[PDB]
């Protein structure tokens, strides 16, 4: 699994 | 604005909220809609600012989703042809959130 965080969340 | 046509798993929020089957996937600035072959609504309309994270592992798709969300929190699964498609999707949307974030300053 590749995985990224929302920056704008 | 990107739109893609996925298939939704029953995996998390697609069986929870029976939003399973083939669907476009509809991306602006600032939202997704998934809306079902051949209807004229939008089934749900997510904001980007209500997303936790998204990724992909092979020719998967995932969004998980936070507690202010219209759906509320809970995750998405979509299935498309190959590892290609869903790494474009991860990037794409990736970079709308990046965009998003750096509006402000």
Redesign the interface.
Known sequence: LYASSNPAY | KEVWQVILKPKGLGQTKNLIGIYRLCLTSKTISFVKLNSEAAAVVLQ??????????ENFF?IEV?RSAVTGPGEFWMQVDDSVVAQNM?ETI?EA??A??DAFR
């Open positions: 980007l600012m209500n997303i936790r994270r998204c990724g992909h592992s995932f936070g991860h990736l959130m990046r998003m974030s």
